[PDB]
Amino acid sequence: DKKQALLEAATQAIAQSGIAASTAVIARNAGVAEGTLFRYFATKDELINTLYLHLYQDHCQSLIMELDRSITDAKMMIRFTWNSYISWGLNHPARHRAIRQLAVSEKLTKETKQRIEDMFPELRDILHRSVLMVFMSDEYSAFGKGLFYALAETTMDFAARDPARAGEYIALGFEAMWRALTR
Amino acid sequence: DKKQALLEAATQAIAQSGIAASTAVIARNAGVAEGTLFRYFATKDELINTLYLHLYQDHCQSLIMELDRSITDAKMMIRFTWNSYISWGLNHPARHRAIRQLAVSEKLTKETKQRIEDMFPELRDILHRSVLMVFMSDEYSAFGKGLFYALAETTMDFAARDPARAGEYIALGFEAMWRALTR
Ligand SMILES: COc1cc2c(cc1OC)[C@H]1Cc3ccc(OC)c(OC)c3CN1CC2
Ligand SMILES: COc1cc2c(cc1OC)[C@H]1Cc3ccc(OC)c(OC)c3CN1CC2
């Protein structure tokens, strides 16, 4: 649909030009009038919230399928989630570049945040037992996600530039992320 | 001099368009012919190395002056260095955006890396006792710097967007950086 085209154009524009990207640019790049964009997303805020759910789901749905019926401890599940996320961002640079800006956005609604939290219950539960309490507070939750994405971004940058050592940067990134964010 | 203008234009271009930025763009933005740029920096590699020393020194020289004749432990000195760095990046976004790309560049020479290491001996010594050994290895030194800059960047982004909580994001960033990078 045009909706998927819009979502893709919004991913590219936000990855490239930041979360501030124009609805005009986004509409133009999807090959539609801006008025058409507005029929699908009345507000930039709606677009941020919908795009974030769509991109989060793009990664999360494949991860849920891979992990299903495994028995993991907290750290194992979290390492799988981290390695999966780096793979996804390597495969889909713009998706990662857009999502890490969306996830820390002031414009996310409580409903959206709750949907993201509950999309993968097994992981939510593991994170609740593992994440430093400060980074599950209303005030600092987005900052803890930001730090994850920052470390993930660095990891992807080194893995892409020096693919010979990709797994080493992913493991070292994971280890630093774990220390930085867990109890 | 034109050299300072070139360094400033190279800071802006690299911050904006990445370490890949054109010598033509850089020369144009400094108001000189590209041939003139080449009289000051024969190679893009020379420009990366010189710009990185210049920007590192821009922060480090003021930090050395502030810390002089203090008695600090490792962690105190490192917290001062981190808070100083966030202040600098808030005051000088392009300087931070350029430097974090320069510092992980494959084009840095051994001489440059050694000059950066030795510019502030007291801090070098403290870091040698504090930094995880992996992040002082030849192979992963740049990756450990990258992770620092990533966490610093996130911290600056939240401190700039939500200045009411700047010190809280700086302290939480510092705490995560410390866990991620130290023994
Ligand atoms: C787009 O796909 C994802 C992105 C993210 C996630 C999970 C995702 O897929 C399921 C998780 C994964 C994760 C790991 C470890 C954490 O702290 C120890 C953590 O809290 C800060 C977080 C919270 N989220 C960070 C961003
Ligand atoms: C541009 O100015 C600076 C940038 C940086 C530095 C110091 C600087 O000014 C003196 C230091 C500060 C610092 C802290 C803690 C570290 O690990 C615990 C560390 O190793 C990774 C590093 C290494 N460098 C990161 C980048």
Coordinates of N, CA and C in Angstrom, one line a residue, chain B residues 56-139:
Chain B
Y56 N 41.4 17.6 19.9 CA 41.7 16.9 21.2 C 42.3 18.0 22.1
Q57 N 43.3 18.7 21.5 CA 43.9 19.7 22.3 C 43.0 20.9 22.7
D58 N 42.0 21.2 21.9 CA 41.0 22.2 22.2 C 40.3 21.9 23.6
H59 N 40.0 20.7 23.8 CA 39.4 20.3 25.0 C 40.5 20.0 26.1
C60 N 41.5 19.2 25.7 CA 42.5 18.8 26.7 C 43.2 19.9 27.4
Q61 N 43.6 20.9 26.7 CA 44.4 22.0 27.2 C 43.6 22.8 28.4
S62 N 42.3 22.9 28.2 CA 41.6 23.6 29.2 C 41.4 22.7 30.4
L63 N 41.2 21.4 30.2 CA 41.1 20.4 31.2 C 42.3 20.3 32.1
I64 N 43.5 20.3 31.4 CA 44.8 20.3 32.1 C 44.9 21.5 33.0
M65 N 44.4 22.7 32.5 CA 44.6 23.9 33.3 C 43.7 23.8 34.6
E66 N 42.5 23.3 34.4 CA 41.5 23.2 35.5 C 41.9 22.3 36.6
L67 N 42.5 21.1 36.2 CA 42.8 20.0 37.1 C 44.2 20.2 37.8
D68 N 45.0 21.2 37.3 CA 46.4 21.3 37.8 C 46.4 21.5 39.3
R69 N 47.3 20.8 39.9 CA 47.6 20.8 41.4 C 46.4 20.4 42.2
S70 N 45.4 19.7 41.6 CA 44.4 19.0 42.4 C 45.0 17.6 42.8
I71 N 44.5 17.1 43.9 CA 44.7 15.7 44.3 C 43.5 14.9 44.0
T72 N 43.5 14.0 43.0 CA 42.3 13.2 42.7 C 42.7 11.7 42.8
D73 N 41.7 10.9 43.1 CA 41.8 9.5 42.7 C 41.4 9.3 41.2
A74 N 41.7 8.1 40.7 CA 41.3 7.7 39.4 C 39.9 8.1 39.0
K75 N 38.9 7.7 39.9 CA 37.6 7.9 39.5 C 37.1 9.4 39.4
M76 N 37.6 10.1 40.5 CA 37.4 11.6 40.5 C 37.9 12.2 39.2
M77 N 39.2 11.9 38.9 CA 39.8 12.6 37.7 C 39.0 12.2 36.5
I78 N 38.6 10.9 36.4 CA 37.8 10.5 35.2 C 36.4 11.1 35.2
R79 N 35.8 11.3 36.3 CA 34.5 11.9 36.3 C 34.7 13.4 35.9
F80 N 35.7 14.1 36.4 CA 36.0 15.5 35.9 C 36.2 15.5 34.4
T81 N 36.9 14.5 33.8 CA 37.2 14.5 32.4 C 35.9 14.3 31.6
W82 N 35.1 13.3 32.1 CA 33.8 13.1 31.5 C 32.9 14.3 31.5
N83 N 32.7 15.0 32.7 CA 31.8 16.1 32.8 C 32.3 17.3 31.9
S84 N 33.6 17.5 31.9 CA 34.3 18.5 31.1 C 34.0 18.2 29.6
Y85 N 34.1 16.9 29.2 CA 33.9 16.6 27.8 C 32.4 16.8 27.4
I86 N 31.5 16.5 28.3 CA 30.1 16.8 28.0 C 29.9 18.3 27.9
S87 N 30.4 19.1 28.8 CA 30.3 20.5 28.7 C 30.9 21.1 27.4
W88 N 32.0 20.6 27.0 CA 32.7 21.0 25.7 C 31.8 20.7 24.5
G89 N 31.3 19.5 24.4 CA 30.4 19.0 23.3 C 29.1 19.7 23.3
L90 N 28.6 20.1 24.5 CA 27.4 20.9 24.5 C 27.7 22.3 24.0
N91 N 28.8 22.9 24.3 CA 29.3 24.2 23.9 C 29.7 24.2 22.5
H92 N 30.1 23.0 21.9 CA 30.8 23.0 20.7 C 30.3 21.7 20.0
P93 N 29.0 21.6 19.6 CA 28.5 20.3 19.0 C 29.3 19.8 17.8
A94 N 29.8 20.8 16.9 CA 30.5 20.3 15.7 C 31.8 19.7 16.1
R95 N 32.5 20.3 17.1 CA 33.8 19.8 17.5 C 33.7 18.4 18.0
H96 N 32.7 18.1 18.9 CA 32.4 16.7 19.3 C 32.0 15.8 18.2
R97 N 31.1 16.3 17.2 CA 30.7 15.4 16.2 C 31.8 15.0 15.2
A98 N 32.7 15.9 14.9 CA 33.9 15.7 14.1 C 34.9 14.8 14.9
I99 N 35.2 15.1 16.2 CA 36.3 14.4 16.9 C 36.0 12.9 17.1
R100 N 34.7 12.6 17.4 CA 34.4 11.2 17.6 C 34.6 10.4 16.4
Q101 N 34.5 11.0 15.2 CA 34.7 10.3 14.0 C 36.3 10.2 13.7
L102 N 37.0 11.3 13.9 CA 38.5 11.3 13.8 C 39.2 10.3 14.7
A103 N 38.7 10.1 15.9 CA 39.4 9.3 16.9 C 39.3 7.8 16.6
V104 N 38.3 7.4 15.8 CA 38.2 6.0 15.5 C 38.7 5.7 14.0
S105 N 39.2 6.7 13.4 CA 39.7 6.6 12.0 C 40.9 5.7 11.9
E106 N 40.7 4.8 10.9 CA 41.8 3.9 10.4 C 43.0 4.8 9.9
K107 N 42.8 6.1 9.6 CA 43.9 6.8 8.9 C 44.9 7.5 10.0
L108 N 44.5 7.3 11.3 CA 45.4 7.9 12.3 C 46.7 7.2 12.3
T109 N 47.8 7.9 12.4 CA 49.1 7.3 12.4 C 49.5 6.9 13.9
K110 N 50.5 6.1 14.0 CA 51.0 5.7 15.3 C 51.5 6.9 16.1
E111 N 52.2 7.9 15.4 CA 52.7 9.1 16.0 C 51.5 9.9 16.6
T112 N 50.4 10.0 15.8 CA 49.3 10.8 16.3 C 48.7 10.2 17.5
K113 N 48.5 8.9 17.5 CA 47.9 8.2 18.6 C 48.8 8.3 19.8
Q114 N 50.1 8.3 19.6 CA 51.0 8.4 20.7 C 50.9 9.8 21.3
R115 N 50.9 10.8 20.4 CA 50.8 12.2 20.9 C 49.5 12.4 21.7
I116 N 48.4 11.9 21.2 CA 47.1 12.0 22.0 C 47.3 11.3 23.3
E117 N 47.8 10.1 23.4 CA 48.0 9.3 24.6 C 48.8 10.2 25.6
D118 N 49.9 10.8 25.2 CA 50.8 11.5 26.1 C 50.6 13.0 26.3
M119 N 49.5 13.5 25.7 CA 49.2 15.0 25.9 C 49.0 15.3 27.3
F120 N 48.2 14.5 28.0 CA 47.9 14.7 29.4 C 48.4 13.5 30.3
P121 N 49.7 13.5 30.7 CA 50.3 12.3 31.3 C 49.6 11.8 32.5
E122 N 49.0 12.7 33.4 CA 48.4 12.3 34.6 C 47.1 11.5 34.3
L123 N 46.4 12.0 33.3 CA 45.2 11.2 32.9 C 45.6 9.9 32.2
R124 N 46.6 9.9 31.4 CA 47.0 8.7 30.7 C 47.3 7.6 31.8
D125 N 48.1 8.0 32.8 CA 48.5 7.1 33.8 C 47.3 6.5 34.6
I126 N 46.3 7.4 35.0 CA 45.1 7.0 35.6 C 44.3 6.0 34.7
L127 N 44.2 6.4 33.4 CA 43.4 5.5 32.5 C 44.1 4.1 32.4
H128 N 45.5 4.1 32.4 CA 46.1 2.8 32.3 C 45.8 1.9 33.4
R129 N 45.6 2.5 34.6 CA 45.3 1.7 35.8 C 43.8 1.3 35.8
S130 N 42.9 2.0 35.0 CA 41.5 1.9 35.2 C 40.8 1.2 34.0
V131 N 41.2 1.5 32.8 CA 40.6 1.0 31.6 C 40.7 -0.5 31.5
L132 N 39.6 -1.2 31.2 CA 39.7 -2.6 30.9 C 40.8 -2.9 29.9
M133 N 41.6 -4.0 30.1 CA 42.8 -4.2 29.3 C 42.5 -4.3 27.8
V134 N 41.3 -4.9 27.6 CA 41.0 -5.1 26.1 C 40.9 -3.7 25.4
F135 N 40.5 -2.7 26.1 CA 40.3 -1.4 25.5 C 41.6 -0.6 25.5
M136 N 42.7 -1.2 25.9 CA 44.0 -0.6 25.7 C 44.9 -1.4 24.7
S137 N 44.2 -2.4 24.1 CA 44.9 -3.2 23.1 C 45.0 -2.5 21.8
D138 N 46.0 -2.8 21.0 CA 46.1 -2.1 19.7 C 44.8 -2.2 18.9
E139 N 44.2 -3.5 19.0 CA 43.1 -3.8 18.1 C 41.8 -3.1 18.5

